[PDB]
Design a protein around this nucleic acid. Structure first.
Ligand SMILES: [Zn+2]
Lengths: 99, 63, 195, 55, 134, 149, 214
RNA sequence: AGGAGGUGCAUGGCCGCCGUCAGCUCGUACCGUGAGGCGUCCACUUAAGUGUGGUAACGAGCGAGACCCGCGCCCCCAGUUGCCAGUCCCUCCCGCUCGGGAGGGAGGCACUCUGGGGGGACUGCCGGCGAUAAGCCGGAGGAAGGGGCGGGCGACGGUAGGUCAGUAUGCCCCGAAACCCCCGGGCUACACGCGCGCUACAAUGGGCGGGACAAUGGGACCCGACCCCGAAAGGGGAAGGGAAUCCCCUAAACCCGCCCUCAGUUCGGAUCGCGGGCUGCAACUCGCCCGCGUGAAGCUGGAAUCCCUAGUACCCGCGUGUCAUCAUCGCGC
């Protein structure tokens, strides 16, 4: 079996990669486990606006969201070559492991 | 405060003038046809326009 | 963790962009793009005047690759130079050009009006240029030249518009130049029409 | 005149072991995710680093 | 016939399973008759007393509750039990009685915590530091 | 009838009374001169608190087993009066819990699950269940609503 | 201490607290009758839900109102019995279980000592402690005047409950009397019209000032 | 070269206040010799220069709204690292097992959950008021009735308001000193005035034993389950975890049982003695923790003054930022 974890800061790129993998699996005819959406990771940083100490304190909360999807497939020669031939856009990160 | 918007009122008036027979006093039907006939992409705005066109049709039928 | 990789990549892109902005001020710098390839990394630099970026004999490009690899730690980088899609719609480039004109010594009013007219005639819904600093005397001022339609409050103003800022180092001090441009084809939520 | 002086001694902890990569400050360094960025720098930088102010 | 229902209150989620039995109601495996405090026990018991002895001694209920406090879990279990009873008997008169007595037994409670804000945060959204004025 | 059908304290006290008989559970020599946690101000006021603590530990192993020293310490901790400083939560000591668990193991009521903790053996399970059954039989007379259970 | 039967009391009918029924409770004052809610209710706990609405507390059971009023500190910006009762960390604020237990004990004491319905005695106390007139500043022309005004039924109920709770707190403050005993004594005294009660004394004070200023 | 030397009365950028206030303006026409005026006024309405109607003005721009994020209801898809309701097997326990309960495997995703796309709420309907409009009050249905609830976004300008000691920077100055490094000290001093807080002045309690229920977030010289040692602090080995898989993490307020019974007390825990530890190259100036010992004001507070309209206020604890150690603090749960 092969487990693939795909994470990105762009939901559209995430979905594009997921759809490409799904199409590859469908054309190869191999059963595929649907994309598991893992909980989004939200990095929040709260910072004081003023560069000095004078004035009423005000803060801004800058948030960076990272979205994660998981897929499980059964290993095959053509399927795995096609998957390794994925586009993997710049903002998406892909990890492949075998079980 | 709850007052209708300028562009909402203008869009409703021009829509009802352009398609007199394509709207009635039914909010659901007005909503469907507003979504079909307008480039609106917001559900809230679409509901605004649909409600106001329903009001305009009611006024017309009243006289 | 995975967030640590995202953060390191963002920070590296930061430092490279800032260094290139310092280096290519006179080259009409517009931005950069970094991509990963099996052999290494590829860096595309958008410049209105690739002549300066390439230099004579390729020495500038050679040294730039050397620096961006050793100092910034990128892995086997290859640098390509491209033209700006439209220099008159990139706010940063226009701000840098106006600052350079002020440094040259053109009257601020004439330079601002010329830049505004050129940007408007090159295609834009609206434009606004703010000049702040020691103008017309020792007491600093802040004058704005505006034309067309523009937005400054809300998500449309945050996203649609392009903003740039630059500093002109004259003899009497620093002048701040701010440029905001609304590119053509941008539709505000208020604009809807029958189909 | 030797060069053994004029050199910062090695430091592994304290406010003297962290600096802003962009500013060189010594005070409010953000280490939330290894940013190593000063408070002012991060504030001026957040929109274009991928961070956003959703609400 | 096994029937499942859900109830939510604040951060408390209760899943109730109802079947045919003798009248055994268990919350997390512990009988409802020894629920402490009496306030929470009464909150849990109210729907059954409203329904009556006949229906009460005709069904068995097992409730699993997570999250929240001792009152939130009790109210979530109350909602789950009320919904399970209503759907099990299918009695519109009983549903009407429940609605008139307490609309919240069948309908959830939308109220949630309002996020805190600066100026003495960690105390509340609107709590503010005392101002010196001089 | 089992542990889940009986209030915790009424069962714990009875288990302590019953455990006073078993010879493998004896207070340590340092028991009289020790508090039950750094967060406690004054040492116990029972003179037989050891048996109550051991019964509580046994019931905890029965319910949430397998468990360990650190998690039992978390359970047995509590708020501390720090004086002018605000109140804060702290864990409990480890020697009491470790010795209680070792004594229970010697008695045969618990056993070590390697890398996981300590789990109740069938003998201890039967002991606790018998005590709970007796308590429930006693309670049923006062509360008729518990008969059906 | 208390019997296991009381510890694990299991109600089987819909009545106030599962022990006392309000079917026989009688309210005379026609002004206050539409506002003293006596509908069947097992647990007097509505989790608020009546603050959003206007006149939304006119449908909250009287015992729940009493519990909410008891849940307090006693005094922070107003002096009670010539003293402040600023209980910071030992107050009953946000402890509805404690307020509920205190009210239960007070009702038990009232029934033991009187032989009648504790809720009926509480009703009587409210009727006796509800003022009928007050005074306020009203401006006509360019200056103010100290005029006399009436009190609406809901304000009368609010004042009565507030006075009863404040009297109970004052009686219990730094005294051998427990809170439940203080509340029971205050309610009984208000029902009996004995001027010793804080509620009756304050009602008479407001009444006399209003009469003098009218 | 360098400069945390001066100048924020030379600047940029940034930020607080006017102010999330509703205001600030433009094209043409018209009135006035002119500065200027009209539009931007009047009646009603709105949180709003929000909108209807009348007019020497007709249109328009930037603000407001729109917009963006999250919460609450329902449907579709998705079933792992998340979940265990039904069904099978194994093991154990109880009133001797009719019956009931627990755990592990297979199995399922049924419910919760995570996260993508959609629906729903729109004065849409009814009665009344206003004038038939703008709109307002109440009612039915509904999860959500009137800006759905909370937030992000701060207009033309001013405030010579704060910031050169965060970075940049004009002028002035040191330039072998004001530049750069090393030890030691200070920023921690203490007759006294003030701001914001913690603990308390007790029974709406203190102590002792026992019984319950969370969420947000973080983890590589890092979190560390689990076992052994110690009375506590703490010490030795060490599984697992780059994370829906492991851990931080079995919170307190609360509930039961016993003692105390109105007392400067079994309240209150300042202030010192002795001893044991942790971090750190270094603990005296000047760190934190632990056991025993003593037990200072304080018994509710004048004038005056502060915050808050619903899961809000009040009470109760926890996460994180600062961190080798140190949270009576900020931001959140
Ligand atoms: Zn910096």
């Amino acid at each position: 079996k092969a487990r693939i974890k795909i994470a990105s800061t762009n939901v559209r790129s995430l979905d594009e990669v997921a759809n490409q993998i799904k199409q590859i699996a469908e054309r190869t005819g191999v059963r595929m486990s649907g994309p598991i959406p893992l909980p989004t990771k939200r990095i929040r940083i709260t910072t004081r606006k003023s560069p000095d100490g004078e004035g009423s304190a005000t803060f801004d909360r800058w948030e960076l969201r990272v979205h994660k999807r998981l897929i499980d497939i059964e290993a095959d020669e053509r399927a795995m070559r096609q998957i390794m031939r994925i586009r993997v856009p710049e903002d998406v990160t892909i990890e492949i492991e075998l079980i | 405060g709850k007052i209708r918007q300028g562009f909402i009122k203008r869009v409703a008036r021009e829509l009802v003038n352009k398609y007199p027979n394509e709207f009635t006093t039914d909010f659901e039907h007005n909503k469907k046809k507003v979504q079909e006939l307008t480039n609106v992409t917001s559900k809230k705005i679409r509901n605004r326009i649909a409600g106001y066109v329903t009001k305009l049709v009611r006024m017309k039928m009243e006289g | 963790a995975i967030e640590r990789y995202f953060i390191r990549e963002a920070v590296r892109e930061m430092l490279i962009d800032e260094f290139l902005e310092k280096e290519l001020r006179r080259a009409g710098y517009g931005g950069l793009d970094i991509k990963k390839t099996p052999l290494g990394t590829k860096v595309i630099i958008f410049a209105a005047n690739p002549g300066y970026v390439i230099g004579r004999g390729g020495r500038r490009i050679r040294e730039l690759t050397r620096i961006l690899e050793k100092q910034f730690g990128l892995e086997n980088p290859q640098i390509e130079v491209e033209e700006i899609k439209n220099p008159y719609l990139n706010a940063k480039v226009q701000a840098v050009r106006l600052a350079q004109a002020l440094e040259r010594g053109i009257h601020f009013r004439r330079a601002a009006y010329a830049a505004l007219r050129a940007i408007m005639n090159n295609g834009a819904r609206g434009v606004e240029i703010r000049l702040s600093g020691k103008l017309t005397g020792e007491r600093a001022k802040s004058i704005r030249f505006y034309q067309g339609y523009l937005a400054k409050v809300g998500n449309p103003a945050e996203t649609l518009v392009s903003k740039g800022y630059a500093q002109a180092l004259l003899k009497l001090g620093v002048i701040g130049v701010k440029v905001a441009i609304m590119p053509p084809g941008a539709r505000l939520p208020d604009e809807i029409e029958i189909i | 005149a030797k060069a053994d002086y004029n050199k910062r001694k090695p430091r592994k902890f304290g406010k003297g072991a962290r600096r802003c990569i962009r500013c060189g400050q010594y005070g409010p360094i953000i280490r939330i995710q290894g940013l190593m960025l000063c408070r002012h720098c991060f504030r001026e930088v957040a929109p274009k680093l991928g961070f956003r102010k959703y609400e | 016939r096994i029937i499942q229902t859900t109830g939510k209150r604040k951060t408390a989620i209760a899943r109730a399973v109802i079947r045919e039995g003798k009248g055994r109601v268990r919350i997390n495996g512990k009988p409802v008759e020894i629920i402490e405090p009496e306030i929470a026990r009464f909150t849990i018991l109210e729907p059954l007393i409203l329904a009556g002895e006949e229906i009460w001694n005709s069904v068995d209920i097992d409730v699993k509750v997570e999250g929240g406090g001792f009152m939130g879990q009790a109210e979530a279990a109350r909602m789950a039990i009320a919904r399970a009873l209503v759907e099990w008997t299918g009695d519109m008169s009983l549903k009407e009685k429940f609605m008139k007595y307490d609309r919240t037994m069948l309908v959830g409670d939308p109220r949630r915590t309002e996020p805190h804000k600066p100026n003495r945060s960690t105390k509340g959204p609107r709590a503010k530091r005392q101002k010196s004025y001089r | 009838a089992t542990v889940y059908d009986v209030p915790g304290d009424l069962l714990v006290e009875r288990v302590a009374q019953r455990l006073k008989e078993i010879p493998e559970i004896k207070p340590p020599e340092w028991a009289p001169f020790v508090k039950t946690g750094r967060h406690k101000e004054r040492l116990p006021e029972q003179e037989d608190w050891w048996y109550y603590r051991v019964a509580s530990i046994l019931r905890r192993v029965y319910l949430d087993g397998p468990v360990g020293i650190e998690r039992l310490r978390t359970y047995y901790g509590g708020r501390k009066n720090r004086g002018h400083a605000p109140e804060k939560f702290y864990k409990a000591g480890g020697s009491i819990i470790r010795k209680a668990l070792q004594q229970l193991e010697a008695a045969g009521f618990v056993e070590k699950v390697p890398g996981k903790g300590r789990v109740i053996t069938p003998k201890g399970r039967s002991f606790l269940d018998k005590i709970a059954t007796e308590l429930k039989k006693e309670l049923e007379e006062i509360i008729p609503e518990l008969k059906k259970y | 201490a208390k019997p296991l039967n009381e510890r694990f009391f299991i109600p089987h009918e819909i009545k106030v607290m599962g022990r006392w029924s309000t079917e026989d409770v009688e309210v005379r004052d026609p002004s206050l009758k539409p506002y003293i809610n006596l509908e069947p209710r097992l647990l007097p706990h509505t989790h608020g839900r009546h603050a959003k609405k206007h006149f939304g507390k006119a449908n909250v059971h009287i015992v729940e109102r009493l519990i909410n009023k008891i849940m307090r500190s006693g005094g922070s910006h107003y002096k009670v019995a010539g003293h402040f009762m600023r209980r910071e960390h030992r107050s009953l604020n946000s402890k509805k279980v404690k307020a509920y237990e205190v009210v239960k004990e007070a009702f038990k004491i009232i029934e033991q000592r009187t032989g009648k319905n504790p809720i009926q005695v509480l009703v009587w106390a409210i009727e006796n402690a509800a003022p009928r007139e007050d005074t306020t500043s009203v401006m006509f022309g360019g200056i103010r005047y100290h005029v006399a005004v009436d009190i609406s039924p809901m304000r009368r109920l609010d004042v009565a409950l507030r006075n009863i709770a404040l009297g109970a707190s004052a009686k219990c403050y730094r005294n051998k009397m427990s809170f439940a005993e203080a509340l029971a004594e205050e309610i009984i005294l208000a029902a009996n019209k004995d001027p010793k009660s804080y509620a009756y004394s304050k009602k008479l004070e407001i009444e006399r000032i209003a009469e003098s200023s009218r």
